[PDB]
């Protein structure tokens, strides 16, 4: 059963084992059951923590239903893979990734008064060879000020930094003037769409190149895992993979009554159904009731 905060996260979700939890709840409200009152409680810390642990119950089955585009040629299987993660994060309640990491910067550094503190409280979320490349620019601009640069914007010393911080961002490859003119808007919507269509060709070149960099790491992890495995004899592999299957059944068979472990062994029995159903008719595949 659900606690109604799960079933509100599973309404716009699309995966299987959540939508059969929604369809079983939507059939119960139809049969004369009353809907629970949604609690207007658990102030800002518990409210943003339940969002962390309810969106991860939408992301986690959703990531497993997204086929990686490994060993593929072209940019369209990466634009498929990234768009499946865009539409997955939207079903889990996330916003656009540009909107969601810019929210992460202003959350970490609401009280950062110096530019060296905003470069060290948003350190985990910026590429480290870009964060370091903004420290040679911060140390160069610190020479002509000889005082700490403040996070003001109206300060002239911040404009001396942002004259050379923008100089890195174009050299990194990202058009900072098309980013900044997108999030500022424009007056007329005709020239607001000339910057919208140049932000979204950066952004589509942005979300692809790190969806592709996520694939090329899985391609290089699977090729180093396989080439470590092709060097073994076949008898070593058969007993190494039989102990790992035994110790991980045993970890789920010791934990009894837990929800995850009794759902784990229903997956082992459903894997064995797939092998048993293919073994009965292998030119057609598994048998679906249809």
């Amino acid at each position: 059963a659900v606690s109604k905060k799960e079933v509100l996260y599973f309404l716009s979700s699309k995966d299987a084992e959540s939508s059969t939890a929604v369809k079983s709840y939507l059939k119960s409200l139809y049969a004369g059951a009353q809907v629970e009152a949604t609690e207007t409680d658990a102030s800002e810390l518990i409210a943003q923590l339940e969002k962390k642990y309810l969106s991860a119950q939408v992301v986690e089955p959703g990531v497993h239903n997204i086929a990686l585009p490994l060993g593929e040629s072209g940019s369209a299987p990466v634009k498929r893979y990234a768009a499946e993660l865009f539409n997955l994060g939207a079903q889990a309640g996330f916003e656009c990734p540009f909107i969601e990491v810019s929210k992460k910067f202003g959350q970490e550094t609401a009280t950062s008064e110096t530019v060296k503190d905003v470069l060290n409280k948003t350190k985990s979320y910026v590429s480290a060879d870009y964060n370091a490349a903004l420290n040679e620019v911060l140390s160069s601009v610190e020479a002509e000020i000889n005082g700490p640069v403040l996070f003001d914007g109206k300060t002239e010393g911040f404009k001396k930094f942002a004259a050379k911080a923008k100089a890195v961002a174009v050299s990194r490859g990202l058009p900072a003037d098309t980013i900044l003119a997108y999030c500022a808007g424009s007056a007329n919507e005709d020239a607001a769409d000339k910057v919208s269509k140049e932000f979204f060709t950066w952004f589509e070149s942005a979300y692809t190149a790190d969806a592709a960099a996520e694939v090329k790491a899985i391609e290089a992890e699977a090729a180093s895992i396989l080439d470590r495995h092709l060097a073994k004899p076949v008898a070593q592999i058969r007993k190494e993979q039989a102990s790992a299957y035994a110790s991980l059944l045993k970890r789920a068979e010791t934990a009894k009554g837990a929800k995850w472990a009794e759902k784990y062994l229903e997956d082992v029995k459903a894997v064995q159904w797939f092998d048993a159903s293919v073994a009965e008719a292998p030119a057609s595949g598994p048998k679906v009731a249809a």
């Binding site: 990686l68 992460k104 910067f105 948003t122 391609e219 993979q241």
Partner: protein, 176 residues
């Protein structure tokens, strides 16, 4: 697909481009006289203008029946297509069994025959471990949990450095 679509017998395909399907439709102003033939079978019915519009009323919603998951199959398919590239260079190995005769035995230096009989025993080591295709399913499960924990991010599943850098210049170069 959306709830309302706007396609059917208007700029439709009237002729097939293959030979295994020969399709010809007769575009009446109201209806369409279709005739499709595939080998020995012939089907010639009639569809209306409003009968193609009700087709997209209920959606098919094709979904994949995978053994473990769709993610896991995409890693195992890559390991299978990697295990084929290594099988292809075990296919170009020279036939050592054409030199198993005793007229190659007794002509050869005895240490260069131990090396040759161990180079043949190494091929059967390499060939029996690259055709162990039942081992590739449990290899793809060593790639899944590190990948799925990267997608279980606190920012976004689809976030990476290039988006987060370009959203840092929007954050930094605006006034705090």
């Amino acid at each position: 697909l959306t709830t309302f679509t706007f396609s059917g017998l208007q700029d439709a395909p009237v002729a097939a481009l293959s030979g295994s399907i020969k399709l010809n439709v007769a575009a009446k102003a109201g209806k369409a006289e279709v005739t499709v033939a595939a080998g020995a079978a012939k089907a010639a019915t009639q569809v209306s203008a409003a009968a193609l519009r009700k087709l997209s009323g209920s959606k098919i919603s094709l979904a994949e029946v995978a053994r473990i998951s769709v993610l896991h199959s995409s890693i195992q398919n890559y390991l299978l297509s990697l295990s084929n590239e290594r099988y292809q260079l075990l296919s170009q190995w020279p036939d050592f069994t054409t030199m198993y005769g005793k007229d190659f035995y007794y002509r050869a230096h005895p240490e260069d025959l131990k090396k040759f009989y161990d180079a043949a025993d190494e091929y059967y080591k390499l060939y029996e471990t690259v055709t162990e295709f039942d081992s590739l399913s449990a290899l793809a499960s060593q790639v899944v949990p590190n990948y799925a924990a990267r997608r279980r991010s606190t920012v976004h599943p689809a976030i990476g450095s290039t988006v987060a850098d370009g959203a840092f210049t929007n954050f930094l170069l605006s006034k705090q």
